[PDB]
Each structure stands twice: as structure tokens, then as C-alpha cells.
Symmetry: C2
Subunit: 133 residues, 2 copies
């Protein structure tokens, strides 16, 4: 069939290193990309294609309700159990992750179309900013 | 505002390594994760949240009409300029990327529930198999 539409998830990838070597792709980029799964989203209408190739390392999903304490197992991260509670401190979204670690949690808040996110653990703080897509 | 719904693309990321160092994230995972951008898709209905975070590294999109040669600037790959032409051969989608590299192109066809991709660059051939999600 000529119908290539849909979302396609990779299950095999042989000689991806040789094809990148022949493409003159630098050594450091080759080693990051050689161990990432691929996702192809093909939008085809007759003879017109819109091909989208996303290469991902790891996905992490968490679901919660504000005010309800839940157990968050950080699988594929540090693989720990933490008692997490997400509350509103204004329009900022605060979350404490009570567990084996100290001062562990995050803070989310929106302004305009920028997502401010701070991640804390022990005495380390990571500051990320996301512009909306 | 209290509405964080939507898809968010990472703009900045300071001290992401130190935060993962705090979490005792394994070294093999740390060196890869710090070099990759992130995407966050937040599904929010009131206080009910559904948070998804992905570790990416380089997307590639391409648009073409079958039979219409076009200018493929291979951005995110090797950023060479090749004039690609996509044609049908039975139900196999064949593309030839004429440029500095010989025998450069790919073949993309469907058999059942699986997408088959065969990227070639001179001496090397990479072959991938996807499954429909």
C-alpha cells in the first residue's frame, strides 16, 4: 500500500552508525544519536508529504490532583519513592517531594507564554524556561 | 495565571547537571541528558494535571511533492544542500539527494503494520523498521 499516514515508532535500527559516518556527522553527535529511539509522524495527502522525525531519549509522565498527596515512583529517573503534594502558592505551582532526599521538589508558574520551572534537590537548583509551541 | 495547558519547548536550562548530580543520576544518563533539549506537554483541567516531559535532541522535518524536485538543506543533519527528488516505484517511495555525497537518498515503503526505511549514503546503508502506533 502507498498509505504511509500515521505515527510510527522505531523498533530496529541497523547500521545507523555507518550511515552517519558516511554523512560526515561529527563523532560526538554520532554517539548521542546512535542510542535514541525514533518517532515518525507522516502527514500525506495524495502526492504531498509532511514528514516529521523526532528522536527521543526518555519520556517521564506524572499525573496528580492539586491538594492530593500521591506516591511518585521516578522510574527511568533516580527510581525512588517520594510522597509528593502539589499546591497553589498564588499562581505558582509548588510541589514538595517528601522522601529519601532533602529539599526535593519543583515550582511551576506561567507568565505570558513562558513557563518558568525550577527543580530543587538538596542544595542544587535547576532553572528552566519554556516558550510555548 | 493558573493555566499551564499546552505544549512547551525548552528555551534555557541552567544547572541541569547539578540537579541530576544531586539525584545521584547515573553518569551514563547524565552526560546524554544535559546535551538534549526538552519538551513538556501539560494537559490541565482545573486542579487535575497530566504532565509529560521528553528528552529530545534534534528534530528533522521535510516537505515534498512526489515528482517535484526541491531544495533540501539538511539542517540538523550535516547541513549540506542537496536537490532531492521523491518518486514512486510500485509502492516504494524512493528519494535521490543529488549533491556532494554519492548514492545518497532513502527508500520508504509499507508492509502491513510496519514502516520500512532504508537510508543510503555512498558505501553505507542504514535500515530501520517502525510500527504504527
Amino acid at each position: 500500500t502507498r498509505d504511509q499516514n500515521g505515527t510510527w515508532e522505531m523498533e530496529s535500527n541497523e547500521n545507523f552508525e555507518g550511515y552517519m559516518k558516511a554523512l560526515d556527522i561529527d563523532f560526538h553527535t554520532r554517539k548521542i544519536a546512535v542510542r535514541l529511539t525514533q518517532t515518525k509522524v507522516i502527514d500525506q495527502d495524495g502526492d504531498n508529504f509532511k514528514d516529521k522525525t523526532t528522536s527521543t531519549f526518555r519520556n517521564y509522565d506524572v499525573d496528580f490532583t492539586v491538594g492530593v498527596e500521591f506516591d511518585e515512583y521516578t522510574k527511568s529517573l533516580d527510581n525512588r519513592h517520594v510522597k509528593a503534594l502539589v499546591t497553589w502558592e498564588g499562581d505558582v505551582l509548588v510541589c514538595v517531594q517528601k522522601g529519601e532526599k532533602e529539599n526535593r521538589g519543583w515550582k511551576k508558574w506561567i507568565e505570558g507564554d513562558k513557563l518558568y520551572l525550577e527543580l530543587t534537590c538538596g542544595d542544587q537548583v535547576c532553572r528552566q524556561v519554556f516558550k510555548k509551541k
